[PDB]
């Protein structure tokens, strides 16, 4: 076989996918001397108008004729491998594979690999700057937006990748240093018809041939296959190898018995965050990045935006912009372990995509807190408790009714469980309106 010294040279190689990964796999050929391929269903891609002329190009459909003469198909996440043209190549045997497949057979450096359902991206920053803090030339991509195959460079000293379960799908070369499942949560439901265990079954491939697992000890189903192994390291809320403390007010990341750093010199807020900062040190701790630099990037890390982000703190109430959140999983995520001393202004609402809201009920009992509804599915969810709610049509009526009530020690929490394209562009812009209107409300 090739060995390390995989060649595509005199290869009919066929990529399915014009978005910015595509692209980043004809790069990848283009640059090794092999013009591929390339189609994609959409009549009109944004990603042709990046395209050299020499690269034959077919859109509107996939070109069955086409993927039955590769050599190799690459196959962007966004198309399943149960298509049914893949399918057929696949019975034919044709090779395919992905972006993040080209990548682990050309990386040169160790790579920390990222899935899960929710704090993929924050734990992939969080272990970049944790790096850039020890001065290491990290290469931080997987994001739709930075394609790993452009992070390729003999100069990088450290990759780290968020990966998600369709990618995992096509990839058989991953041997990360550390990888981690933050979670698994019901999502995508569309492309795993057998349901939980089968959307698990593509994020459990990120632990094969891992060197370190980092596992989270509350979600059994970030557990490796066969279950705990000497290669298993944990984070969790109350215990773990990772772990939080709360102790009178205040509180602790403690690692193996040990209070390693008081939250008060972090950035970020809430329990979410703070286990994603403790998976992200478990990662960063496997890959043999120092300790002492890791924390140090800790307490200058701001976090994502979007992702539990205080947009504004004043006159005792905090703003919390978690427009990420845009499925009951991750609302969930925001609401456990919550932690308000006065009330909590909870905001719901936009396309809630015929989810079971029934998972947040249980959250939104006792006194001290009141739900504000909007957008298109606003009605399903003020029916969690309605003695309690109030519904409007956007998300600017409903901050206008809190705005007057809010009191100190109270939290405005946009956490809304839904997608927001009924009424935003997308959940970038939902969580930017909310932070305008808490500054010109607050
Ligand atoms: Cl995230
Ligand atoms: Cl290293
Ligand atoms: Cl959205
Ligand atoms: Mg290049
Ligand atoms: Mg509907
Ligand atoms: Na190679």
Same mark, same amino acid.
């Given at each position: 076989?090739?060995? $390390?010294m995989? +060649?595509?040279?005199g290869?009919?190689?066929?990529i399915?996918?014009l978005?910015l ?8 050929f283009?640059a090794?001397?092999?013009?591929? #391929?390339?189609?994609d269903?959409?009549?009109?891609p944004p990603?042709?108008?990046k395209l050299?002329?020499?690269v ?7 070109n *069955?004729?086409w993927l039955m003469?590769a050599?190799?198909?690459?196959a962007?996440p ?6 049914? $043209? ?18 682990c ?6 790579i920390v ?7 993929? %991206? ?13 001065? @290491?030339?990290?290469?931080?991509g997987g994001?739709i937006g930075?394609?790993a195959?452009?992070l ?10 968020e990966?998600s379960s ?5 990839? %058989?070369?991953?041997?990360?240093v550390?990888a981690?499942?933050l ?8 492309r ?6 089968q959307?698990?079954?593509?994020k459990?491939?990120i ?6 697992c980092?596992?989270?000890? +509350?979600?059994?189903?970030?557990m490796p296959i066969?279950?705990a *192994?000497? #290669?298993?390291? %944990? ?7 990772y772990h ?5 007010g205040?509180?602790?990341?403690? @690692?193996?018995?040990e209070?390693?750093?008081? @939250?008060?010199?972090?950035?970020? %807020?809430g329990?979410h965050?703070?286990?994603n900062?403790?998976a992200?040190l478990?990662?960063? +701790?496997?890959a043999?990045?120092?300790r002492?630099?890791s924390?140090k ?8 935006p979007?992702r ?12 919390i912009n978690?427009?990420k ?5 991750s ?10 001393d006065g ?7 936009? *396309? ?5 809201f029934?998972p ?9 807190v009141?739900?504000?509804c909007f ?16 519904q409007?049509?956007?998300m ?13 020690? *109270?939290?405005?929490?946009?956490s809304?469980a839904?997608?927001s394209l ?7 812009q939902?969580?930017?309106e909310?932070?305008?209107?808490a500054?010109?409300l607050?």
């Amino acid at each position: 076989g090739p060995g $390390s010294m995989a +060649d595509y040279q005199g290869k009919n190689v066929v990529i399915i996918g014009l978005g910015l990964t595509g692209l980043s796999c004809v790069d990848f050929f283009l640059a090794r001397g092999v013009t591929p #391929r390339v189609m994609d269903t959409r009549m009109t891609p944004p990603g042709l108008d990046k395209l050299p002329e020499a690269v034959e190009r077919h859109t509107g459909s996939l070109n *069955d004729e086409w993927l039955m003469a590769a050599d190799l198909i690459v196959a962007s996440p966004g198309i399943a491998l149960a298509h049914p $043209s893949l399918s057929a190549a696949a019975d034919a045997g044709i090779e395919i594979v992905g972006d993040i497949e080209l990548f682990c057979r050309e990386a040169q450096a160790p790579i920390v690999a990222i899935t899960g359902s929710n704090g993929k %991206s924050t734990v992939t920053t969080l272990v970049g700057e944790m790096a850039k803090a020890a001065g @290491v030339n990290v290469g931080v991509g997987g994001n739709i937006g930075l394609p790993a195959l452009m992070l390729l460079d003999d100069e990088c000293e450290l990759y780290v990748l968020e990966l998600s379960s369709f990618q995992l799908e096509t990839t %058989s070369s991953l041997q990360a240093v550390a990888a981690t499942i933050l979670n698994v949560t019901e999502d995508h439901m569309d492309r795993y018809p057998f349901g939980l265990q089968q959307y698990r079954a593509a994020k459990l491939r990120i632990y094969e041939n891992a060197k370190v697992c980092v596992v989270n000890a +509350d979600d059994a189903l970030t557990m490796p296959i066969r279950g705990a *192994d000497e #290669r298993c390291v %944990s984070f969790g809320v109350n215990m773990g190898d990772y772990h939080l403390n709360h102790q009178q007010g205040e509180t602790w990341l403690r @690692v193996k018995g040990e209070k390693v750093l008081n @939250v008060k010199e972090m950035k970020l %807020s809430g329990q979410h965050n703070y286990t994603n900062a403790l998976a992200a040190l478990a990662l960063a +701790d496997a890959a043999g990045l120092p300790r002492a630099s890791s924390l140090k990037a800790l307490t200058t890390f701001t976090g994502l935006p979007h992702r539990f982000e205080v947009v504004l703190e004043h006159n005792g109430v905090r703003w919390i912009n978690d427009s990420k959140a845009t499925n009951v999983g991750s609302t969930e995520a925001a609401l456990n372990g919550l932690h308000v001393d006065g009330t909590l202004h909870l905001l719901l609402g936009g *396309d809630g995509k015929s989810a079971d809201f029934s998972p947040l009920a249980r959250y939104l009992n006792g006194d001290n807190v009141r739900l504000y509804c909007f957008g298109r599915d606003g009605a399903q969810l003020a029916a969690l408790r309605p003695e309690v709610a109030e519904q409007t049509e956007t998300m600017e009526q409903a901050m206008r009714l809190l705005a007057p009530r809010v009191q100190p020690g *109270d939290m405005v929490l946009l956490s809304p469980a839904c997608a927001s394209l009924d009424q935003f562009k997308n959940f970038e812009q939902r969580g930017n309106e909310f932070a305008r209107l808490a500054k010109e409300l607050g």
